[PDB]
Amino acid sequence: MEVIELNKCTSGQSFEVILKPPSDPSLEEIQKKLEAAEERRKYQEAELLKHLAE
C-alpha cells in the first residue's frame, strides 16, 4: 500500500496507489475504396435501366 506522485494544486490533487507490483491507408487508397463502391452502384443502376429499357 504505497502512494506515489502526489501532485497538489489549488483545484485538486492526483496520485497513484500501488497495492502489489506486477508479475494506415493513404489518401489514394481511400479514394479507391470510395470510388470502387461508387462504380458498383453505377453498374447496378445501369442494369436496372437496361432492364427497364427491355
Binding site: 497513484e16 496507489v17 502489489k20 470510395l34
Partner: protein, 438 residues
C-alpha cells in the same frame, strides 16, 4: 496549453454533444451568449478551459466543436436552441437526407460527397490551435451516419492528422430505445474499420443508461434528454482533467498510456456514482467509501457486465467534490478485502487517482440531484468483451440468412466486407479471452 477538437456525428453524437457543452458552460461559468465574466484575459489566454473554448475579441468563448449530421432536423435544434450564440454556422454541418440506418449509405454513398466539406470545417478549427492534441468523436453505433460516416472520418483524420490522438464516445445499441433492426450490422462494420484509427473509446450502452434512469432517477419511460443529461455527466468527468488544472490525464495521450496497454483492447469500462433523483425529499450524502464501493456494483456501469469474471489491465478513479487522498485509500483498502479484483499478471495492481475539488455541476431543472462528491472509475476489464459477444451473436443470427444485406450491397459495399468485419470481431473476442481467462 494544447487544444482538443470535439466532433459530433449523427443524431446521437449531436444531441449528446449539445448536452455536454451545455454542462461545460455551467461548469466554466460561461453564459449562453458566450461571455465568461471570470475570464480576465479578454480575447485570448492559455488557461485549462481554453483547450475546449476559443476566444474572440468581443470576449466570447466558442467551443472547439464540429457538428456533422446528414440531415438538418437535429442540428437545427442547436441553431435555434438555448446556446445558439455559442457556435458559428461553419461549425454546424448538415445534409438533406440521412443514411437510413444504413452504414454503407453513410460511409460510401453520402459520406463520399460530404467528407471533404467536413475535413475543411475541421481544418478551420485546427488552424486556430497552437498545439492540437487530437479529437473527441461522439457518435452512435447503430445510426447509418453515426456508424458509416464516422469510420470514414476516422480514416481521413488519421491521414490528415497522423500524430494526433483520437478518442471516441460511442453509443452501444439497446433495443429498448432503438427502432432500427440492422444496428448489429452497423455496430460491427464501424468497429472493424474504426478500430485501427481510435486510441481509446468509451462505449456507453443505452440499456445501462436506461435502467439507471428508471431505477435511480425513477423515470418510468426515460427520454433521450434524460439519457443525454446523464451521459454528459460521465463525459464531463472524463474530460474534466483536460479542462481544469490537474496532473492526471492532462492530455489525450495520457488516456492511452494509463488505460490501454494493448492497442486493440482500448474499450475502458466506465462506472459512475452517485446518481440521485432530484425529486427526492432529501438524500443522505454518501461517503468516499460508499461511492467508491459503488464503482464495483454492476448496476451503475455504462455497460452491463461482470468484472468479477474478467481481469483488469488499468484503473483510474476520478473524483469530483469533497474528497481527500486519505479517504480514497481507506476505501480502496476496504474494497480489496471484500471484492473480487483480479489483475492481469503483466500489469501492476494499482489505481491512478484524480481529485477535482469542484463537485459535479447539475443542469438547473434537470433530473440529477446536487451531491457533495462523486466518482467515475475508468477500468479496462476483459469483461466488457461480453458486450462484443452479445453484439457479435446478433450479427450471426441475421447474417446466416443474409437478412438486410441487400440494402448495404445496394449502396456499393461488397458482401465480403461483412465477413471481413465479423472475422475481425472474432479476432477481437479472442484477444480478450487470451488476456483474461486461464
Amino acid at each position: 496549453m494544447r487544444e482538443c477538437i470535439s466532433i459530433h456525428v449523427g443524431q446521437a453524437g449531436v444531441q449528446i454533444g449539445n448536452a455536454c457543452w451545455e454542462l461545460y458552460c455551467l461548469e466554466h461559468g460561461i453564459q449562453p451568449d458566450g461571455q465568461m465574466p471570470s475570464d480576465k484575459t479578454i480575447g485570448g489566454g492559455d488557461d485549462s478551459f481554453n483547450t475546449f473554448f476559443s476566444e474572440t475579441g468581443a470576449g466570447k468563448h466558442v467551443p472547439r466543436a464540429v457538428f456533422v449530421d446528414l440531415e438538418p432536423t437535429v442540428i437545427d435544434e442547436v441553431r435555434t436552441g438555448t446556446y445558439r450564440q455559442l457556435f458559428h454556422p461553419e461549425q454546424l454541418i448538415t445534409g438533406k437526407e440521412d443514411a437510413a440506418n444504413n452504414y454503407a449509405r453513410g460511409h460510401y454513398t453520402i459520406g463520399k460527397e460530404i467528407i471533404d466539406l467536413v475535413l475543411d470545417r475541421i481544418r478551420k478549427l485546427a488552424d486556430q490551435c497552437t498545439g492540437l492534441q487530437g479529437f473527441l468523436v461522439f457518435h452512435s453505433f447503430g445510426g447509418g451516419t453515426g456508424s458509416g460516416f464516422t469510420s470514414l472520418l476516422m480514416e481521413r483524420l488519421s491521414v490528415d492528422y497522423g500524430k494526433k490522438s483520437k478518442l471516441e464516445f460511442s453509443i452501444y445499441p439497446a433495443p429498448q430505445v432503438s427502432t432500427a433492426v440492422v444496428e448489429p450490422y452497423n455496430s460491427i462494420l464501424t468497429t472493424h474499420t474504426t478500430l485501427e484509427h481510435s486510441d481509446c473509446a468509451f462505449m456507453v450502452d443505452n440499456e445501462a443508461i436506461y435502467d439507471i434512469c428508471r431505477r435511480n432517477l425513477d423515470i418510468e419511460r426515460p427520454t433521450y434528454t434524460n439519457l443525454n443529461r446523464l451521459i454528459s455527466q460521465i463525459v464531463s468527468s472524463i474530460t474534466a482533467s483536460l479542462r481544469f488544472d490537474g496532473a492526471l490525464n492532462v492530455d489525450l495521450t495520457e488516456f492511452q498510456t494509463n488505460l490501454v496497454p494493448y492497442p486493440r483492447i482500448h474499450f475502458p469500462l466506465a462506472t459512475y456514482a452517485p446518481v440521485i433523483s432530484a425529486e427526492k425529499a432529501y438524500h443522505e450524502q454518501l461517503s468516499v467509501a460508499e461511492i467508491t464501493n459503488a464503482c464495483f456494483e454492476p448496476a451503475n456501469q455504462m455497460v452491463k457486465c461482470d468484472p468479477r469474471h474478467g481481469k483488469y489491465m488499468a484503473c483510474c478513479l476520478l473524483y469530483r467534490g469533497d474528497v481527500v487522498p486519505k479517504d480514497v485509500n481507506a476505501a480502496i483498502a476496504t474494497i480489496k478485502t471484500k471484492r473480487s479484483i483480479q489483475f492481469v499478471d503483466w500489469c501492476p495492481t494499482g489505481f491512478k487517482v484524480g481529485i477535482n475539488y469542484q463537485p459535479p455541476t447539475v443542469v438547473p431543472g434537470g433530473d440529477l440531484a446536487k451531491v457533495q462528491r462523486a466518482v467515475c472509475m475508468l477500468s479496462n476489464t476483459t469483461a466488457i468483451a461480453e458486450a462484443w459477444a452479445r453484439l457479435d451473436h446478433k450479427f450471426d443470427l441475421m447474417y446466416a440468412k443474409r437478412a438486410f444485406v441487400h440494402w448495404y450491397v445496394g449502396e456499393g459495399m461488397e458482401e465480403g466486407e461483412f465477413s471481413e468485419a465479423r472475422e475481425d470481431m472474432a479476432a477481437l473476442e479472442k484477444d480478450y479471452e487470451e488476456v483474461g481467462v486461464d
